[PDB]
Amino acid sequence: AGYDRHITIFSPEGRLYQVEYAFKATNQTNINSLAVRGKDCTVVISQKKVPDKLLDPTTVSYIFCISRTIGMVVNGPIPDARNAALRAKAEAAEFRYKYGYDMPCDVLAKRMANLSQIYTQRAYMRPLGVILTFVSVDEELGPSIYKTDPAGYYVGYKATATGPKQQEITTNLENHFKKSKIDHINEESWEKVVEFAITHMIDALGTEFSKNDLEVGVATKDKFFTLSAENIEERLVAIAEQD
Amino acid sequence: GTGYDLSNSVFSPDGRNFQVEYAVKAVENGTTSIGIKCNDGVVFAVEKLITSKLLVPQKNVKIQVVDRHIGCVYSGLIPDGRHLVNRGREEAASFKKLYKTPIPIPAFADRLGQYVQAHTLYNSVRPFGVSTIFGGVDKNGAHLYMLEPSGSYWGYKGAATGKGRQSAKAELEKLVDHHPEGLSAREAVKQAAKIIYLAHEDNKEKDFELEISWCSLSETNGLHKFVKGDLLQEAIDFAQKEIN
Amino acid sequence: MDIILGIRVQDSVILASSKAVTRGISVLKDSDDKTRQLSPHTLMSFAGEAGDTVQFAEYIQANIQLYSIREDYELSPQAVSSFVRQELAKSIRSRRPYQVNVLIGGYDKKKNKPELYQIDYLGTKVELPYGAHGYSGFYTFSLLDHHYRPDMTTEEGLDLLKLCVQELEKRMPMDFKGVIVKIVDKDGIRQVDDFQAQ
Amino acid sequence: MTDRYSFSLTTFSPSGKLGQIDYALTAVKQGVTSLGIKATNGVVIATEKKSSSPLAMSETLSKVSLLTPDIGAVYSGMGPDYRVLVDKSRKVAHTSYKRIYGEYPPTKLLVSEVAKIMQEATQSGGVRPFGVSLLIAGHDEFNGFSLYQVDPSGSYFPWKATAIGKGSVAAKTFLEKRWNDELELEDAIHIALLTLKESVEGEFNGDTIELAIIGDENPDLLGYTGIPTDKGPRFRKLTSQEINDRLEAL
Amino acid sequence: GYDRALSIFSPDGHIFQVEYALEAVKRGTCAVGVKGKNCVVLGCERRSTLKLQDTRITPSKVSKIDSHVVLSFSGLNADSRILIEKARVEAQSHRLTLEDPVTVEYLTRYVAGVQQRYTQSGGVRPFGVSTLIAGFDPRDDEPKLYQTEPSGIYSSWSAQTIGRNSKTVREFLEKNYDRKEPPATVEECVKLTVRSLLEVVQTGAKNIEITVVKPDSDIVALSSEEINQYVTQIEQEKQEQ
Amino acid sequence: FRNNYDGDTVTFSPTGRLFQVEYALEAIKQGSVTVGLRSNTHAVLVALKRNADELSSYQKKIIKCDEHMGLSLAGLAPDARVLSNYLRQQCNYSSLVFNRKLAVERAGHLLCDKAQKNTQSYGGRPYGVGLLIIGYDKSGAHLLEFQPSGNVTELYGTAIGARSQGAKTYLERTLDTFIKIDGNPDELIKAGVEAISQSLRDESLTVDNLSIAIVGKDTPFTIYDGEAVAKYI
Amino acid sequence: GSRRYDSRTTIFSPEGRLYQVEYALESISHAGTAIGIMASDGIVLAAERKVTSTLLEQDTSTEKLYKLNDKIAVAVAGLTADAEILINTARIHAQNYLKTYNEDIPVEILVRRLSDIKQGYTQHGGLRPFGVSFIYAGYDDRYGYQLYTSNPSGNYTGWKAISVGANTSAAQTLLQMDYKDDMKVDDAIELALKTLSKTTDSSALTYDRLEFATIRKGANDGEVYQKIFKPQEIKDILVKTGIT
Amino acid sequence: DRGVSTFSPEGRLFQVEYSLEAIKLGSTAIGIATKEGVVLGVEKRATSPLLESDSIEKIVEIDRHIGCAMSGLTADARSMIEHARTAAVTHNLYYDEDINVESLTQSVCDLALRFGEGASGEERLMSRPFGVALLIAGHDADDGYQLFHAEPSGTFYRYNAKAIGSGSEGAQAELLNEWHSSLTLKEAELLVLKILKQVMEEKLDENNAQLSCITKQDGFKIYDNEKTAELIKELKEKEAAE
Amino acid sequence: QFNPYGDNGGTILGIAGEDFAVLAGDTRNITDYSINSRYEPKVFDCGDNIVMSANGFAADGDALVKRFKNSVKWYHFDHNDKKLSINSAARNIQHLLYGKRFFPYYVHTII
């Protein structure tokens, strides 16, 4: 009876506690990330925290290059995140082979969401404690942000945020868009979109960042790439000469 | 309610996997082992408790090689350690067979990572009772890694696990600050012999045997080899000396 | 091949089957009964490949006896022939097909009429007044086409068969060592022990 | 590894209830209201697009799905479960019908397929029932227009009109008052909008409501010309604008 | 896929699922079998929880396995069918390969093995059935009566009963059956069988069915009258005292 | 506590223990004592065979795995049979495929690995037997101690089973002595019987109660029982 | 492991009863009542539709009466979805028989097979049983008109009249009270409606809450005909029999 | 619940120990090995006077040189006997010789621990251990006459004499004092008959008890009732003799 | 097409004496008209006082002998070091050979 809390079957209230507790695990890393769409690019910002001095900072990341055009940032423990990344990469590569064209960001998102739905319905599989944010500049849809969770749910966003202080980032972004009246950052260069992204990250969290406190991924026509400490520093300086 | 810690792949109300956490306990109860990344390679060393005079000296080797360029050492349930290396070896052979080139350390790490992470997905298996320090040299440098029972792993400058991990980490952190330019393979060996002698205090009751191995582009040609004879004694002394 | 003949008269079905079993250069047996009773009112005769022949016959016999016990009822001759046709139709597309041809002669106690079915190893089934497998039809059909009458008595049927066997013994190159004859009617199956000179 | 859950997760309780099915139904009750109304020359299905955040792009999430060119579905309960059910329904319509007979399945049969899939999650080993209720509306030459409801147990029933989810009780009552066997499609659409308004808390427009119909053939939505017998799909999702136009005559 | 061990040992050395399988047998309608000097009779009782049945088509309690062997049982009806079918199949197989019908002991040993197997195979529960198998070995005139139970144990009896109140009717048979002089007649054997059932059936002319098995596949079931006649002659044996 | 975490081998206790494995180890302690020790030229196995009744035999505790290898068991006999059989196959494979005698150290690795699998998977159970493996290969004499946990250790000598601690302390004392008994088997065995008698209590090793096995330089693993061990009592 | 969550759907109670079968029957006892009555010239099947609405489409509805063959039909009491699974396989077994023997399947053969399927879910597989009970009405040339019943346990029996579902105790007593061997189809039709009329847990017994069917051998033909009454046809027979 | 192959905290397998309990409830079986052959006797223990005692088969032939007696859940022994007979015949087909009694026993014991719900070691498809113990007796050129006790634990011990079943502890104590290396076959027969008489609830006679033996010369034979009845009479006389 | 068989020549002779027996064979191994070796033993001591030779296609002959020797080894393991009698070895070899009845060891063997 009390096992309706150990495996994924309904509770008398029609709930799935394991999926709920999986959502809880997504915040275990205490990291926040946000993504925004530019005029022709998609940017993703994510806090980077390297506590141990014995760690090689270069190997600590939660952003992944899924395919030449798709990037994915994960909110949740690293092992489940890497499990998700490997699967997504294999899926993206297979799709290209079978259908002759690059897997679209939203399709890969639906596919990963469906796999998640399965862990939600089959008892022997546990949900992954992660939230996946996919980004790219789709050849048909333009800049795109699609996010999936342990419930198998997924949807597209104008912008989005994930993590412990998700709500604050979200309202901040909501406000900016109620003001701008448009669904994207009307900037021609991705560098400025990255700057916007970081600027609002700061405002919302009320914190300052050094070049080693952030992690950035950018998606443009035919390519998704992550920024280096120095590329970021150049970003932080620019925003500094405005405040 | 309770009972969330009785089955392996179950999320507790706070989002944890207690069985993995209990596995960690098995690790902390184990012998101490470490790894130090140098300017062109990596060094591995471990504590071998001498249960009695009956144990043939130098015989029960713990450090293991994977392929010809990777070194692996672990703390916890030894048999789980061997199991993981066997997989690592198949994973490496399969990589070389298809791609010809021996497996890059980062790639090798994810292979071990995915496999261990896999043992936290079902209740039909138990998580691995060991933390593993491994690494080597490849196309672009040396790499040091440590993998936890959760499947979590990262690249390290220095790393340690087991009974005296704190002493070790303390010692390792010192070296990091005092050597921003990079330690050398020769130096890392001695430094390693010491960190282990020091970290042995958290088990000072039993006598032990030191074991070291290394993989250096200049000292071993990028191949993993064990430290033996003179070079070994030399590091033993360097340690016995600084332990007083 | 062997001789397998069947004739359906007014109230019975008669099956005549050669007694010889030849293997290469020698006739090994001259009293072989190429028949199996499937049920009290259903008889099946057969010819074909050396081992397949009996193995198939007995396999069918086993299945029908099992059906009889389970249902405590006797399947109609038509039902039995359909079961047999399907077995052979599966066999023809299997790894090693049963090379067996059969005649099913049965008395339908519900319709109160005799029935004769001819089925080859491909699963080709047909219902006839009289039939045969192999070369037998080539020598005997002209005789049956001529003398056959739906109201014939069992006795007239036996005389017509005798005529067929005599034609077979005159024109056929092989010595099939005579035939064993069996009658199937409302009272079951019985063997005409006296045809060696009837 | 290896799924070792080869025993049922849904079983009978001493009272004769199948707990997991009941609970699944409970999940459906918490779901957003959705409904369907059958007219004499069409069928309409609608639901509310409960955007989970203003940053989310509601269009990128269709609760009303086309299954065959003459059949559509909507639901209440767990969206993820519905999404996979739609993928499976679209596929079975092909593998179990179109690839056999060269024509799309009639509404009742596809509903029967969907229902079977759901029934199996009620008995097969190691699974939980689907936490959704669907409303399938379609049209086929020999059965005309139809509307069906499929529950977590796999049971389904035909309706003249009905609603599921949150305010189904109220909505059903409101539909019984306005329904008659002479409603034209436009009348049904109008009635649908009125029924849906009582279930919506906030904004009620063509961007917060999703609505589709099974009506006449849309030769303009076919994509090609040249085959007299191919006249176009009967399923058509209404546009945000088409909805607003009708909301002014509310 | 499902292979859970449902029949296992408990601390005291018992297999509860096999034990409970017997409880299902105690709940079933009573069955009895008595062997004469030249025949074996099998009697069963007919429940009455509901009456309005079609006796023509409703499955009878005694089943023919082959033309010379029959099987009756007490317990779950659904379960018995499985064993009956397997026994019938085995009977034909034996004839096909050995060219001889099964002996009663062989057929019994087969059914018993199937039952035993279901007590130590994963994913399956034991049969909630006990059987009485009777008949005559091919070309033999010596009557045969065997009994099998859920555990797979079996043995031959001069007379035996199973099912509810079989405790009662067994006693009757124990103090009414002489191995020295077994019912030398089909008639006096059928009588002893009806007498034993009346000890528990409580007046049930339509609640008692008999089946007589004689050598050479001579098997026949009595009709209500034929039996009702035996009942009548028996009630007088009492009153005439 | 314990009761909630010892229902199977796939469950860690809150402190990181594996009770089923530990319980298996307990089967070894309950087993009769057996001793193993080696010099630089030979390796010896001395095992105390236990009997059920005085009408029963004294169960064999030593199995030969190849001409150059063999072992002694303490615990569930059946498990020893399964494990030695596996060892026999591995020795065999090495010979047939590589024309190479299996290294004692390699055998130890194989046993560890085979046992480990039965401690991380649902449905199985750990092996409930301890093993002492002796052999003479391309690196001389060898003695190995195998535990169901999968832990295998190379030693100069040791003992497992009930009261094994007696013989063990004795050998840990006699070390410097016996390790030099090269070229003289009889001495090595005598030293083996002296270590084992240090674990007696109940009775005294008799003729049909003592079992000895030896292997070395020019001696293929052979087992002595009964009369053959008389000259050592 | 998984054992922890296994309900063990196929075990005996200490009393020798099968838990799940018993609980499934309990489930069935809350299902709309279904009645079967066999006459000299035919069989009548009548069932009460559980739960209905003004908006329910009755013309296109069927939840209790299903055609299995052209000579066999069943009345359902229990989970409709479970029923359809069994009905579909039953429809297939009938055709397999027809293709094999070129004769329509005898009614009992089909009933026994379906009951055997049910019995299986009772002894192995670890799955829940089907929450269904059937009343089979059919005709064959060996036993003519036949009426059978099967439930979750896999047991089946033949009847002259019988009911399944809710209030069978009451319904059975009423049937046993007015049934007569020499009845005629029309008499049976009336008896069925009266019986349901007295056991209904609803206010009145209207046509929109009923399904009706008859298997007769239309004198003017010589063959068997199944008739699954239409809404209006039920409404008629309802007024005629004096229930309006 | 709890695995069928779980270890107790004392290092024992629950199902095996519980198995041994069922065997204690079984009918008594005794075996005596001598240099003139081995005797095997059992208690029929019929449950009702209507049960035909000779249909009770608790002593069976494995091969001409091997016989065996059982005690416990006897239905469980059929597949064991079958395996044993196949093993002996198979050995003869492969080697043109008789299988050694110990090898035959070891083979039967190999089935013992093959139970569980998925034990990582092969494919042990058996839900529980056997609930019956066996006494395998026979003769072979290398080790002469032999008596073995095969338990559901997979272990088998060789004995000079052994009793299993309900009266085993008592009967075994008796065998301890009565057995000596020079017993004659006849002495063993009476000795088995006597011990069965002491532990049996019923009064031993030639119908509720059965004897058998195996000798190099005539192999395995089951004594017919008449032969045993006489031996019983002979036992009563020697007992009443003092 | 690939031919799995070859012929290595050679001749062997076995003679049984009243209390002894011999098994001889030349030591020449060939392929067509070439000599592969002038000394390649073809008669082997398989233990238990049994000598054997499988002449014909050498690869098959070696596999067989090797398989039989391994058979003697396990005979000991499985039957308390009992000695494998010459008649038992013969029956054993029959099974080894018949096991490849449909892809035969192309050799004439003598023990």
Spatial distance between the Cα atoms of D76 and D33, rounded to a whole number of angstroms: 6
In this structure, the number of other CB atoms found within 10 A of the CB of residue E159 comes to 29
E71 — phi, psi (to 5°)? -140, 130
Judge contact between F111 and F146, C-beta under 8 A: yes
Q: Which residues of chain A make contact with B116, given a CB cutoff of 8 A? A: 79
User: What DSSP designation does F80 have?
Assistant: H
Residues 6+ apart with CB under 8 A from C128: C6, C8, C116, C117, C118
Q: Name the residue of chain D whose CA is nearest to G60's CA.
A: D158
Rg (CA), chain D: 19
Residues 6+ apart with CB under 8 A from I1: none
Q: How close is the nearest chain H Cα to the Cα of E171, in Å?
A: 10
Spatial distance between the Cα atoms of E127 and E15, rounded to a whole number of angstroms: 13
Do F124 and H5 lie within an 8 Å CB cutoff? Answer: yes
3-class secondary-structure state, position E9: coil
Mutate to test the interface with H, among E3, E6, E7, E9 (most CBs of H within 10 A): E9
Q: Which helix (H) or strand (E) holds B172?
A: helix B165-178
Amino acid, single-letter form, for residue A231:
N
The set of catalytic residues of B is 31
Do D23 and A14 lie within an 8 Å CB cutoff? Answer: yes
Do B19 and F12 lie within an 8 Å CB cutoff? Answer: yes
Q: Positive or negative CA dihedral for I31, I35, I39, I43? A: positive
Judge contact between B118 and B126, C-beta under 8 A: no
| Long-range contact pairs involving C181-184 (C-beta distance under 8 Å, separation at least 24) | C181/C14, C181/C15, C181/C16, C182/C14, C182/C15, C182/C35, C182/C43, C182/C105, C183/C12, C183/C13, C183/C14, C183/C154, C184/C12, C184/C13, C184/C14, C184/C15, C184/C41, C184/C42, C184/C43, C184/C105, C184/C106, C184/C107, C184/C114
CATH 3.60.20.10 fits F1-233, yes or no: yes
Do H75 and E112 lie within an 8 Å CB cutoff? Answer: yes
Spatial distance between the Cα atoms of E166 and E26, rounded to a whole number of angstroms: 8
Spatial distance between the Cα atoms of A195 and A210, rounded to a whole number of angstroms: 14
Judge contact between E170 and H48, C-beta under 8 A: yes
Q: Which helix (H) or strand (E) holds B226?
A: strand B224-226
Distances (CA, A) of F178 to F142, F144, F157, F170, F184: 14, 17, 9, 11, 10
Q: How close is the nearest chain D Cα to the Cα of E28, in Å?
A: 23
Spatial distance between the Cα atoms of D174 and D196, rounded to a whole number of angstroms: 10
Cα–Cα nearest to B133, from B161, B102, B98: B161
Q: How close is the nearest chain D Cα to the Cα of B83, in Å?
A: 16
The total of structural domains in chain C comes to: 1
Render chain A in DSSP notation, one character per residue.
-TTTTTSSS--TTS--HHHHHHHHHTTTT---EEEEE-SSEEEEEEE-----TTB-GGG--SEEE-SSS-EEEEES-HHHHHHHHHHHHHHHHHHHHHHSSPPPHHHHHHHHHHHHHHHHHBTTSPPPS-EEEEEEEETTTEEEEEEE-TTS-EEEBSEEEESTTHHHHHHHHHHHHHHH-SSS---SSHHHHHHHHHHHHHHHHT----TTSEEEEEEETTEEEEPPHHHHHHHHHHHHTT-
Sheet containing D34-38: order of strands: D161-164, D34-38, D43-48, D209-214, D235-237
Domain that includes residue D237, residue range: 1-250
- Going through F122-194 in order, the beta strands assigned E by DSSP cover 129-137, 140-146, 152-154, 157-160
Do H78 and E152 lie within an 8 Å CB cutoff? Answer: yes
I85 — phi, psi (to 5°)? -70, 150
Amino acid, single-letter form, for residue G140:
D
Judge contact between E42 and E32, C-beta under 8 A: yes
Kindly give the residue spans of alpha helices, DSSP state H, lying in chain H. Answer: 14-24, 78-95, 101-112, 168-178, 185-199, 225-240
Domain ranges of chain G: 1-244
Dihedral Cα E7, E8, E13, E18, nearest 10 deg: 0
What's the full length of chain C, in residues? 198
Domain that includes residue A212, residue range: 1-243
Rg (CA), chain C: 16
Q: Which residues of chain G make contact with F123, given a CB cutoff of 8 A? A: 1
Q: Which helix (H) or strand (E) holds C170?
A: helix C154-171
| D229 touches G at CB < 8 Å | no
Q: Which residues of chain G make contact with H3, given a CB cutoff of 8 A? A: 1, 3
Judge contact between B83 and F120, C-beta under 8 A: yes
Judge contact between D12 and D18, C-beta under 8 A: yes
With 0-12 / 13-18 / 19 or more C-beta atoms within 10 angstroms meaning exposed / middle / buried, residue E41 is buried
Q: How close is the nearest chain B Cα to the Cα of D169, in Å?
A: 35
Domain that includes residue C65, residue range: 1-198
Cα–Cα nearest to E35, from E172, E179, E231: E179
Selected residues 118-157 of chain G with any CB under 8 Å from a CB in chain C: 141-142
- Three-state SS string across chain D, please? CCCCCCCECCCECCCCCEHHHHHHHHHHHHCCCEEEEECCCCEEEEEECCCCCCCECHHHCCCCEEEECCEEEEEEECHHHHHHHHHHHHHHHHHHHHHHHCCCCCHHHHHHHHHHHHHHCCCCECECCCCEEEEEEEEECCCEEEEEEECCCCCEEEECEEEECCCHHHHHHHHHHHCCCCCCHHHHHHHHHHHHHCCCCCCCCCCCEEEEEECCCCHHHCCCCCCCCCCCCCEEECCHHHHHHHHCCC
Of D5, D23, D79, the CB nearest to A11: D23
Q: How close is the nearest chain D Cα to the Cα of B42, in Å?
A: 35
Which pair of tokens denotes residue G24?
A: 């499934």
Residues 6+ apart with CB under 8 A from A130: A25, A26, A74, A75, A76, A77, A80, A81, A84, A150
Q: How close is the nearest chain G Cα to the Cα of A63, in Å?
A: 35
Spatial distance between the Cα atoms of H15 and H153, rounded to a whole number of angstroms: 9
- All domains in chain B, ordered by first residue: 1-244 (3.60.20.10)
CATH 3.60.20.10 fits G1-244, yes or no: yes
| G8 touches B at CB < 8 Å | no
Q: How close is the nearest chain A Cα to the Cα of G15, in Å?
A: 24
Q: Which residues of chain H make contact with E122, given a CB cutoff of 8 A? A: 117, 125-127
Q: How close is the nearest chain F Cα to the Cα of H11, in Å?
A: 4
In this structure, the number of other CB atoms found within 10 A of the CB of residue F164 comes to 24
Distances (CA, A) of D143 to D103, G57, G58: 15, 13, 14
CATH number of the domain enclosing A174: 3.60.20.10
Judge contact between F44 and F192, C-beta under 8 A: yes
Render F92-127 in DSSP notation, one character per residue.
HHHHHHHS-PPPHHHHHHHHHHHHHHTTTBTT----
With 0-12 / 13-18 / 19 or more C-beta atoms within 10 angstroms meaning exposed / middle / buried, residue H48 is middle
Cα–Cα nearest to F233, from F207, F215, F214, F211: F207
Which pair of tokens denotes residue E30?
A: 């009573």
Tell me the Ramachandran region of residue A91: left when phi exceeds 0, alpha when psi lies from -120 to 50, beta otherwise. Answer: alpha
| A27 touches B at CB < 8 Å | yes
Judge contact between H152 and H133, C-beta under 8 A: yes
Helices A190-205/A229-240 angle, 10° precision? 70
What's the full length of chain B, in residues? 244
Q: Which helix (H) or strand (E) holds F225?
A: strand F219-225
Amino acid, single-letter form, for residue F232:
Y
User: Which residues are paired to E219 by β-bridges?
Assistant: E213
How far apart are the two ends of chain G, measured CA to CA in Å? 62
Q: Positive or negative CA dihedral for A72, A76, A82, A85? A: negative
Cα–Cα nearest to C50, from C21, C27, C77, C78: C21
Q: Name the residue of chain B whose CA is nearest to A50's CA.
A: B154
Judge contact between E200 and E208, C-beta under 8 A: no
Q: Name the residue of chain B whose CA is nearest to G5's CA.
A: B7
CATH number for domain E1-241, candidates 3.60.150.10, 3.10.580.10, 3.40.50.720, 3.60.20.10: 3.60.20.10
Cα–Cα nearest to E72, from E160, E186, E195: E160
Spatial distance between the Cα atoms of A84 and A77, rounded to a whole number of angstroms: 11
Spatial distance between the Cα atoms of D219 and F100, rounded to a whole number of angstroms: 80
Do H128 and E120 lie within an 8 Å CB cutoff? Answer: yes
| G139 touches E at CB < 8 Å | no
Q: Name the residue of chain A whose CA is nearest to G6's CA.
A: A3
Chain A partners (3+ C-beta pairs within 8 A): B, D, G
Spatial distance between the Cα atoms of F196 and F168, rounded to a whole number of angstroms: 9
3-class secondary-structure state, position B188: helix
| Long-range contact pairs involving A174-183 (C-beta distance under 8 Å, separation at least 24) | A174/D54, A174/D55, A176/A200, A177/D54, A177/D55, A183/A37, A183/A158, A183/D57
Residues 6+ apart with CB under 8 A from F195: F35, F37, F46, F157, F159, F167, F170, F171, F174
Distances (CA, A) of E16 to B169, D11, E119, G219, H166: 58, 22, 10, 59, 20
Judge contact between A18 and A10, C-beta under 8 A: no
- Three-state SS string across G102-129, please? CCCCCHHHHHHHHHHHHHHHHHECCCCC
Mutate to test the interface with E, among G3, G12, G195 (most CBs of E within 10 A): G12
Place of tokens 């005789």: C143
Place of tokens 């399988």: E21
Chains A and E touch (3+ CB pairs under 8 A): no
Of C58, C59, C70, the CB nearest to E88: C70
Q: Which helix (H) or strand (E) holds H38?
A: strand H37-43
F213 — phi, psi (to 5°)? -140, 140
The total of structural domains in chain D comes to: 1
| G3 touches B at CB < 8 Å | no
Cα–Cα nearest to E59, from E43, E80, E40: E80
Do G2 and F122 lie within an 8 Å CB cutoff? Answer: yes
Residues 6+ apart with CB under 8 A from I49: I83, I86
CATH number of the domain enclosing C139: 3.60.20.10
Tell me the Ramachandran region of residue C33: left when phi exceeds 0, alpha when psi lies from -120 to 50, beta otherwise. Answer: beta
Residues 6+ apart with CB under 8 A from B37: A56, B135, B142, B143, B144, B156, B157, B158, B188
Spatial distance between the Cα atoms of D104 and A150, rounded to a whole number of angstroms: 35
| G2 touches B at CB < 8 Å | yes
Spatial distance between the Cα atoms of I81 and B116, rounded to a whole number of angstroms: 46
- How many degrees, rounded to 5, is the angle at CA D175 between CA D172 and CA D177? 120
Place of tokens 């097969």: D124
Q: Which helix (H) or strand (E) holds B108?
A: helix B105-118
Distances (CA, A) of C32 to C28, C29, C38, C176: 10, 6, 18, 10
- How many degrees, rounded to 5, is the angle at CA E54 between CA E49 and CA E58? 80
Domain that includes residue H135, residue range: 1-242
Do G142 and C83 lie within an 8 Å CB cutoff? Answer: no
Judge contact between D138 and D110, C-beta under 8 A: yes
| E49 touches G at CB < 8 Å | no
Judge contact between A165 and A205, C-beta under 8 A: yes
CATH number of the domain enclosing H166: 3.60.20.10
Render G117-171 in DSSP notation, one character per residue.
HHHHHHHBSS-PPP-EEEEEEEEETTTEEEEEEE-TTS-EEEBSEEEESTTHHHH
In this structure, the number of other CB atoms found within 10 A of the CB of residue D40 comes to 14
| E12 touches G at CB < 8 Å | no
Residues 6+ apart with CB under 8 A from F93: none
Which pair of tokens denotes residue E54?
A: 């079609």
Q: Which helix (H) or strand (E) holds B142?
A: strand B141-147
**Residue I98 C-alpha from the chain's centroid:** 14
Cα–Cα nearest to H137, from H209, H44, H228, H30: H30
Residues 6+ apart with CB under 8 A from G75: G34, G35, G36, G45, G46, G47, G64, G65, G134, G135, G137, G164, G211, G213
Chain C partners (3+ C-beta pairs within 8 A): E, G
Q: Report the structure determination method.
A: X-ray
Spatial distance between the Cα atoms of B176 and B188, rounded to a whole number of angstroms: 11
Do D116 and G8 lie within an 8 Å CB cutoff? Answer: no
Residues 6+ apart with CB under 8 A from H75: E112, E115, E116, E119, E151, E152, E153, E154
Sheet containing G225-228: order of strands: G161-164, G34-39, G42-48, G210-216, G225-228
H186 — phi, psi (to 5°)? -60, -40
Which pair of tokens denotes residue E193?
A: 């069988």
Residues 6+ apart with CB under 8 A from E8: E15, E17, H4, H15, H127, H128
Do F123 and G1 lie within an 8 Å CB cutoff? Answer: yes
3-class secondary-structure state, position B135: strand
Do H9 and F122 lie within an 8 Å CB cutoff? Answer: no
Rg (CA), chain I: 15
Domain ranges of chain F: 1-233
Dihedral Cα C89, C93, C98, C99, nearest 10 deg: 90
Cα–Cα nearest to I78, from H98, H102, F61, H82: H102
Judge contact between E129 and E76, C-beta under 8 A: yes
What's the full length of chain I, in residues? 111
3-class secondary-structure state, position B81: helix
Do A183 and D57 lie within an 8 Å CB cutoff? Answer: yes
| Long-range contact pairs involving D230-236 (C-beta distance under 8 Å, separation at least 24) | D232/D69, D233/D66, D233/D69, D233/D70, D234/D69, D234/D70, D234/D138, D234/D139, D235/D66, D235/D68, D235/D69, D235/D70, D235/D71, D235/D72, D235/D138, D236/D212
E86 — phi, psi (to 5°)? -65, -40
Judge contact between H94 and I91, C-beta under 8 A: yes
Q: Do β-strands D65-68 and E31-35 pair in parallel, antiparallel, or remain unpaired?
A: unpaired
Do F123 and H120 lie within an 8 Å CB cutoff? Answer: yes
Spatial distance between the Cα atoms of A57 and B144, rounded to a whole number of angstroms: 12
Spatial distance between the Cα atoms of A124 and G5, rounded to a whole number of angstroms: 11
Residues 6+ apart with CB under 8 A from G62: G211, G228
